Structure formats: C-alpha cells, structure tokens
Amino acid sequence: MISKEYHIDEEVGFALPNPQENLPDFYNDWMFIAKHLPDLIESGQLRERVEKLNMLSIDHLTDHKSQRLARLVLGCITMAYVWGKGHGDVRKVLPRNIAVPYCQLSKKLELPPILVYADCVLANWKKKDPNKPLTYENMDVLFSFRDGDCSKGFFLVSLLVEIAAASAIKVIPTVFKAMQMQERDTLLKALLEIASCLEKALQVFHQIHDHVNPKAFFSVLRIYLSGWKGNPQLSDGLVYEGFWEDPKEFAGGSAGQSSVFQCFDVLLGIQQTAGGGHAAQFLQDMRRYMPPAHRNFLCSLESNPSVREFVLSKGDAGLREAYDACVKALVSLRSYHLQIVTKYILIPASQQPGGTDLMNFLKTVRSTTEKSLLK
Amino acid sequence: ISKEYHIDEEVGFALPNPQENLPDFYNDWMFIAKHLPDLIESGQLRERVEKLNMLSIDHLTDHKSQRLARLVLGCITMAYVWGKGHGDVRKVLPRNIAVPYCQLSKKLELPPILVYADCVLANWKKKDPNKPLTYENMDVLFSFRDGDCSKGFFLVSLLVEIAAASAIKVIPTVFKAMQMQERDTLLKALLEIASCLEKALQVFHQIHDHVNPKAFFSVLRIYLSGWKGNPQLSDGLVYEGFWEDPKEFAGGSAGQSSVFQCFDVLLGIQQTAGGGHAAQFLQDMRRYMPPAHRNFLCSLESNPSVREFVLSKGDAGLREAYDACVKALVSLRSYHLQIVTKYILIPASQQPGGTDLMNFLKTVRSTTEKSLLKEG
Ligand code: HEM
Ligand code: HEM
Numbered sequence: 042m043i044s045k046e047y048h049i050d051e052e053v054g055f056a057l058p059n060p061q062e063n064l065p066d067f068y069n070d071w072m073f074i075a076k077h078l079p080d081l082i083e084s085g086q087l088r089e090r091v092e093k094l095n096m097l098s099i100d101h102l103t104d105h106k107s108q109r110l111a112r113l114v115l116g117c118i119t120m121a122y123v124w125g126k127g128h129g130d131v132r133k134v135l136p137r138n139i140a141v142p143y144c145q146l147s148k149k150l151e152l153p154p155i156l157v158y159a160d161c162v163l164a165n166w167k168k169k170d171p172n173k174p175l176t177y178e179n180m181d182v183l184f185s186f187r188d189g190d191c192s193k194g195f196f197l198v199s200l201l202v203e204i205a206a207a208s209a210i211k212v213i214p215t216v217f218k219a220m221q222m223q224e225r226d227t228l229l230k231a232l233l234e235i236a237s238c239l240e241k242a243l244q245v246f247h248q249i250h251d252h253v254n255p256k257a258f259f260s261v262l263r264i265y266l267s268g269w270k271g272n273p274q275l276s277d278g279l280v281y282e283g284f285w286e287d288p289k290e291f292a293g294g295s296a297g298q299s300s301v302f303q304c305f306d307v308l309l310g311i312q313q314t315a316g317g318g319h320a321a322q323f324l325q326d327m328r329r330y331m332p333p334a335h336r337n338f339l340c341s342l343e344s345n346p347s348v349r350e351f352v353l354s355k356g357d358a359g360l361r362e363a364y365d366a367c368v369k370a371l372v373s374l375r376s377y378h379l380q381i382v383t384k385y386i387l388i389p390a391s392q393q394p395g396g397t398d399l400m401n402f403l404k405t406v407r408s409t410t411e412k413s414l415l416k
Numbered sequence: 417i418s419k420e421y422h423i424d425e426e427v428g429f430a431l432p433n434p435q436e437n438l439p440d441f442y443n444d445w446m447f448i449a450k451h452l453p454d455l456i457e458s459g460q461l462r463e464r465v466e467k468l469n470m471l472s473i474d475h476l477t478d479h480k481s482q483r484l485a486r487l488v489l490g491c492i493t494m495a496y497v498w499g500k501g502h503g504d505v506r507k508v509l510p511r512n513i514a515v516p517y518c519q520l521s522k523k524l525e526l527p528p529i530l531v532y533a534d535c536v537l538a539n540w541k542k543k544d545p546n547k548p549l550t551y552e553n554m555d556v557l558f559s560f561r562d563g564d565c566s567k568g569f570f571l572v573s574l575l576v577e578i579a580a581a582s583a584i585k586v587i588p589t590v591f592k593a594m595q596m597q598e599r600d601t602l603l604k605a606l607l608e609i610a611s612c613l614e615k616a617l618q619v620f621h622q623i624h625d626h627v628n629p630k631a632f633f634s635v636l637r638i639y640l641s642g643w644k645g646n647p648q649l650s651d652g653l654v655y656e657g658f659w660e661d662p663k664e665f666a667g668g669s670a671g672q673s674s675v676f677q678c679f680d681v682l683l684g685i686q687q688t689a690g691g692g693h694a695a696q697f698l699q700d701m702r703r704y705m706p707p708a709h710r711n712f713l714c715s716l717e718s719n720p721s722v723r724e725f726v727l728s729k730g731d732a733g734l735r736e737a738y739d740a741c742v743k744a745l746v747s748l749r750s751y752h753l754q755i756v757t758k759y760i761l762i763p764a765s766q767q768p769g770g771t772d773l774m775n776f777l778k779t780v781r782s783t784t785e786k787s788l789l790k791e792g
C-alpha cells in the first residue's frame with residue numbers, strides 16, 4: 042500500500058472521502074451565505090452580507106474535513122464577492138472579517154487563499170444514498186454559484202473522471218517494486234492495468250455533454266472559477282485586507298491542480314514540468330495549489346527511477362506496448378479534452394456580442410505526451 | 417544522503433572533478449569555446465559557429481561529458497547571441513548548434529541556456545589534485561572575453577557554494593534528530609549549519625580581490641544575461657531546427673543555486689510561498705537546477721518543519737541555534753546587497769532595472785529576516 046502520510050484514499054484517490062457537509066454552529070453565518078449564493082448574488086445582497094460579517098476565529102474547525110469544508114465555503118464566498126453578478130464588476134479588496142480567517146485557514150492547510158480544484162471538485166460532493174455507488178445519479182455538489190451555472194455537471198463529472206483515473210494510483214507501488222526487483226512480468230501487468238484505468242477515465246468524460254451546457258459554462262461558471270493571476274481585471278492581484286498590505290496574485294482553478302494526471306505524467310517520464318517553458322512553469326506552479334501531502338507524493342514519484350528509461354533500455358516489445366498504451370490513453374484523454382474546449386469555450390466565445398493561448402497551452406501538453414511514445 | 421540526489425560530500429551540489437576535454441569528435445565545438453575571447457574580439461565567432469556541421473550528441477556517453485558539452489555549447493550560445501556585447505544581437509541560433517544543444521538540454525532536463533550549474537558548478541578544475549579547493553589552486557574552464565573577470569566571479573561563486581554546502585550533510589541528522597526527539601543532536605546540527613553559512617560569508621569577501629566592478633558590469637554581465645523579459649530579444653531566441661517559434665529562457669542566477677534554496681526550505685523560510693513575484697521567480701529557477709537537485713529540494717519540503725519543531729519546544733538553546741542559521745542567511749543577503757551596489761548600481765550610475773533588482777533582493781532578504789524567532 043501507499044503510505045498514509047500521502048492522504049490517498051483506496052476508492053476516491055486524491056479526492057476527500059465522504060466530505061463534511063455542515064460546519065459547527067459557530068460558523069452558521071458563513072454557511073448561510075455559501076448555501077444561498079445563487080439568490081444572494083442575483084439580488085445584490087451577497088457583498089453587503091459579507092461586508093457585515095463578524096471576523097470569526099478558525100480555532101473551532103477542529104479537524105481536517107471541517108477545515109476543508111470551511112475552505113470550500115470561504116472560497117465560494119470569495120469568488121462571489123470578487124466577481125459579483127459576473128458582469129465584469131470586480132471587488133479589488135476582500136474585507137478583513139472574511140479575508141483574515143480564510144488566509145489563516147489556508148496557511149494552516151498550506152493552500153493558497155483562493156478556490157482550488159481540491160476545494161470545488163475534491164471536497165465539494167456527497168452521495169444522495171450512502172449505500173449506492175459513486176455515480177452521477179447518486180451524487181450532488183455541496184455548493185454552486187448561480188442557478189443554471191451547470192456547476193453540478195461540471196464539478197461532479199470532473200470528480201468522476203478523477204476517481205476513475207485514481208483507480209490506477211494503487212498500482213504505482215507495484216510499478217516501482219517491479220523495477221527494483223527486476224520483475225518484467227509484474228511490471229507489464231501493472232502498466233496494462235494503468236492503461237485500462239486511463240482508458241476508463243476517458244469514457245467517464247463523455248458524460249460532460251449530458252450535464253453541462255456550453256453557453257452557461259462559458260458565460261457564468263467560467264467567470265466564478267477564474268482568479269487573479271495575470272488577470273487584467275485585477276492587474277496586481279487581490280487585497281486580502283488585514284492579512285497582507287499589498288495585493289496578492291493567485292491563479293483560479295485548473296485541473297492542472299489535479300494530482301492524478303500530474304502523477305501519471307511523472308510516472309511515465311513525460312516530463313511536463315521540465316525544460317523552463319511556459320506550460321511547464323504553469324503545471325509546476327499548480328502543484329502549490331494541491332494539498333501538501335499530494336504535492337509530496339508527486340515529489341516522491343519524481344525522485345524514483347524513470348519507468349520510461351527502464352522500458353526504453355530493455356528491448357522488450359511487450360513492455361514497450363504496455364508503456365505506450367499508458368501514453369496513448371493520456372494523449373486520447375487530452376485530445377478529447379481539446380475538443381471539449383472547442384465546444385465549451387471557443388464556440389461560445391465566438392457567439393458572444395484568450396482562446397488561442399488556452400488551446401496552445403493544452404496542445405503543448407498533449408504534444409509532450411505524444412512525444413513520449415516509444416513506437 | 418542517497419546517491420540518487422547527486423550531492424557530493426566535499427563539493428555538495430557542484431559537479432566533482434569536472435571534465436575538461438570532450439571526445440575528439442567534438443573538437444570543432446571545443447576550439448570555439450576555448451577561443452571565445454579571441455573569436456569575439458576578431459569578429460570571427462559567428463562565422464565559426466555558422467560553419468559548424470551538425471554533430472550528434474550520441475558520442476557524449478556519460479554525465480560529465482554531457483555537462484561539459486552543455487557548458488561549451490552554453491558559452492558559445494551566449495557569445496553568438498550577444499556578439500561583442502555592444503547591442504549587435506542574433507535572434508536565431510543556427511540549427512547546427514541549436515539542435516544538439518537542445519537535444520542535450522532535453523537529455524539533462526535543463527533549459528537550453530547557460531545556467532549556474534554549467535558556468536559555476538561544472539566550470540572548474542584543480543591545478544594540483546593534491547592541494548585543497550582554494551582560489552589559487554583552481555581555474556575556470558571557459559571565459560567570454562579577456563579581462564571579463566569570469567575566473568574571479570565563477571570561482572568565488574563556487575567557493576561560496578562549497579563553503580555553504582559543507583552544512584548539507586548535516587540535513588539528515590536534523591530530520592533524524594527531530595523524528596527521534598534528539599534535542600542535543602539537533603542543537604549541534606543547527607550550530608554546524610550556522611557555522612558553515614557564516615564561513616560562506618567570509619569566503620564571499622574574496623569577490624573584491626578577483627572581480628573589478630567596471631569589467632563585471634560592462635563585459636561579464638552581458639554574457640550572463642538571458643532572453644526572458646529582455647527587450648533586446650522581446651520574444652526570446654529562435655532555436656533553429658528544434659522549435660519554430662522563439663522561446664524565452666532566463667539568464668543565470670544564483671537563485672538557481674540549490675544550497676541557499678535548500679537552507680531556506682530547511683529553516684521554513686518559505687521563499688516560494690504566497691502570491692508575489694520573488695516567490696514565482698525563485699520557484700522558476702528550480703527548473704534551471706539539475707533534476708536530482710530539484711528533487712532534493714522538494715524532498716526537504718516533504719519532511720516536518722524544523723521551524724515549527726523549534727517554535728514548539730520552549731528551549732532557548734534550540735531557538736538561538738535556529739536563529740543563528742537564519743541570521744547567517746540574513747547576513748549573506750545583506751552583504752550581497754552591498755555587492756550589488758558596488759558591482760551593478762555604481763557602474764550603472766557612472767555610464768554615459770537596478771531598482772527592480774534591489775527590490776527583489778530586499779524582498780527575499782526580508783522574508784529571511786521575518787523568519788527570525790527573536791529580533792536579530
Ligand atoms: C467544460 C469542460 C472543460 C473545459 C471547457 C476545460 C477547459 C480547460 C482549459 C481552458 C484548460 C487550460 C487552462 C487551465 O489550466 O485552467 C484546461 C486544463 C486542464 N484540464 Fe480542463 N476543461 C474541462 C473539463 C476538464 C475535465 C473533466 C478534465 C478531467 C480530465 C480536465 C482536465 C484538465 C487537465 C489535466 C488540464 C491541465 C492541462 C493538461 O494536463 O492537459 N478538464 N481545461
Ligand atoms: C559580482 C558579484 C554579484 C553580483 C553583482 C550579484 C547580483 C545579483 C543580482 C542582481 C541578483 C538578482 C537577479 C538574479 O537572481 O539573477 C542576484 C541574485 C542572487 N545572488 Fe547574486 N550577485 C553576485 C554574486 C553572488 C554570489 C557570490 C552569491 C553567493 C552567495 C550570490 C547569491 C545570490 C543568490 C542566492 C540570489 C537569489 C536571491 C536570494 O536568494 O537572495 N550572488 N545577485
């Protein structure tokens with residue numbers, strides 16, 4: 042098994058198992074706002090409500106799940122506060138009574154004070170029926186921004202893809218064991234199981250079309266997920282009033298912050314973070330938005346010997362095909378994902394009364410993946 | 417420390433006993449690198465580079481031959497791009513050098529530009545193998561121009577690196593001491609770290625004896641500069657035959673030194689935390705370190721915090737030992753600010769950026785100073 046210090050679950054992987062839904066009564070004022078964001082944003086009540094909050098101590102968030110729930114709560118409120126109704130009117134200062142505890146909590150959890158993938162995908166879910174499986178029909182999100190924002194469809198499909206990819210994480214100890222022990226057959230089997238899970242993860246992705254509408258995604262949800270790093274709207278970042286004097290820049294959410302896909306790039310020696318380029322820089326930076334235990338797990342994988350070099354050295358057609366099957370699965374995922382971006386970003390952007398830079402980043406990452414094929 | 421991190425007992429992150437000569441196959445590269453001052457001064461460097469045939473990197477069969485080739489190709493690239501360093505600039509690196517350089521850079525997981533690991537850590541030799549690592553028993557392998565003080569700059573940098581790196585071997589003692597709750601051992605370890613970082617500063621004092629401000633500013637500064645955020649090459653460098661579009665890569669920085677980054681990490685200074693530019697920059701420079709050295713840094717980040725261990729213990733002895741380490745880093749950076757004033761700011765004022773560079777350095781110094789438990 043993988044060590045407990047990396048906080049990787051057997052079933053959900055890097056996802057938070059059975060996320061907490063309710064905070065202690067002490068934090069009811071936070072909970073009320075986060076639970077009613079759609080109506081409070083729409084009616085222009087959200088900002089005054091956040092401004093009228095009292096500064097609450099984080100000390101009564103006594104465990105990890107409560108701290109992670111609070112991060113999800115405060116992060117959603119923070120996006121609602123900064124972006125407002127999502128029409129380009131921006132708050133440049135986050136008031137101290139929310140900014141201070143959010144920054145304190147974020148420092149405690151070693152995550153930046155902005156909504157991350159680990160909040161809004163990995164900790165933002167529940168089973169409707171605990172006795173039924175982790176499927177879309179038996180799941181809901183904990184928080185959404187606006188009515189019709191398609192956040193359920195986006196967050197849950199993202200979660201399910203993550204969970205399907207994560208079924209191969211438990212094979213990783215076997216891989217490195219098989220290399221050190223020079224176990225060709227064990228390694229071959231292990232690589233075939235990884236390809237199977239990454240192939241399965243692609244089929245899970247196909248659901249996105251059923252539960253997310255392009256127009257709503259582009260015009261609404263995209264807005265609330267965006268951040269303030271290299272964002273012309275918040276040129277210098279956001280002022281977290283009372284914590285830092287200067288405005289601070291933090292990137293909005295990205296599945297670049299997903300540890301599973303970074304994990305298999307590392308495992309397969311794809312070297313996405315190597316070389317000093319723009320795309321590498323971004324994906325390396327995104328590791329700071331991951332929970333520290335998961336950050337550490339990626340670092341650990343990078344310190345182990347290369348699977349790619351092991352397979353490359355061996356003159357073993359069986360191993361090369363199994364290796365290549367893992368790489369092909371990552372390329373196919375990334376290729377399908379590009380087609381998603383065309384449908385959900387490029388086309389809606391063209392229809393409104395940038396895209397190329399986003400596509401080029403994704404194509405760089407895909408190409409680096411394809412270029413790791415041995416055959 | 418595991419041998420997979422490629423940290424030497426004597427020279428730490430430096431490459432022990434660097435290779436001086438490449439295989440005969442690469443003589444054409446070696447000639448240009450060995451005669452850069454002569455070729456630049458005669459206006460023959462660019463022609464010589466352009467006359468090169470594309471040589472395969474497959475005959476560079478070990479890590480040291482590859483690190484030497486990187487240093488050679490890196491120095492040739494700086495000379496080719498910058499020329500005589502008067503503003504006559506090349507935006508296209510010819511394919512016959514660009515291809516092998518990028519191929520080799522990919523193999524070693526480094527950006528295709530001269531980095532600290534090339535021009536400091538791999539750019540040296542002992543004169544007498546039987547004598548210690550001192551300035552007078554050492555030389556650099558490559559310089560750019562005559563009188564550029566590259567020996568002084570690169571070797572003093574290396575000596576400071578090595579002095580500081582004597583503390584690296586203590587790091588596993590620190591974590592073992594913590595995990596095992598060995599207070600006296602941890603205290604002794606932290607005092608040794610402080611001693612070495614204090615020694616590094618004394619070694620730094622030698623810079624004044626071997627580098628002249630004018631030569632440094634007007635000559636060497638040029639050849640060390642890169643093409644990331646540089647108006648001279650706004651869109652970066654075209655590496656002909658490897659990539660179609662120009663690529664931006666940062667010039668050398670001792671932010672690329674793994675020793676100072678590792679002690680920041682060890683002492684919980686957290687230079688790469690938060691939403692500021694200094695953090696981003698120091699984070700980016702890790703990409704310009706050799707991969708095993710990158711790995712080592714992140715592995716230190718995964719161990720428990722020394723700072724939070726010391727903060728928890730109500731132990732004046734431990735706190736003082738901890739602060740002596742932090743103070744040693746503060747003293748180095750404060751001294752380094754004076755060095756920037758002498759070697760950059762003053763020459764710049766005398767000529768017929770500086771604020772930005774000093775603001776960056778002050779932010780990093782401040783982050784260090786603010787990790788002190790007690791006022792220094
Ligand atoms: C409406 C659906 C989606 C759209 C429009 C979309 C769009 C984008 C865009 C524009 C980027 C580049 C900017 C950034 O990093 O934030 C990106 C990155 C990324 N996305 Fe998505 N995405 C969607 C859903 C998903 C899903 C379900 C996955 C799960 C596989 C995913 C995986 C990734 C990964 C791993 C990256 C980082 C680059 C890479 O590793 O290839 N995305 N996405
Ligand atoms: C002529 C001598 C030197 C001058 C003019 C100089 C100047 C500078 C400048 C302008 C920077 C900021 C830009 C950059 O990162 O490249 C810098 C960074 C840095 N320098 Fe130097 N430097 C000199 C020598 C040294 C030496 C010998 C050391 C060894 C201690 C050193 C250590 C550092 C470190 C560690 C950084 C990154 C910021 C930090 O960690 O504080 N420098 N230097």
Ligand SMILES: CCS(=O)(=O)N1CCC2(CC[C@@H]([C@H]3c4ccccc4-c4cncn43)[C@H]2O)CC1
Binds near residue numbers: 263264266268293295
């Ligand atoms: C860059 C400003 S932008 O306005 O052009 N812009 C880019 C497109 C997105 C769409 C989803 C979002 C990101 C994310 C946030 C949270 C949870 C999962 C995922 C995810 C999965 N793939 C990508 N993302 C981000 O890439 C929104 C913001």
Ligand SMILES: CCS(=O)(=O)N1CCC2(CC[C@@H]([C@H]3c4ccccc4-c4cncn43)[C@H]2O)CC1
Binds near residue numbers: 532640667669
């Ligand atoms: C920004 C373009 S600039 O022209 O203003 N400019 C900044 C000042 C420097 C001075 C040395 C150099 C860097 C370095 C390169 C190789 C080996 C060790 C070290 C080193 C140590 N401290 C700093 N550096 C860089 O920071 C030159 C270029």
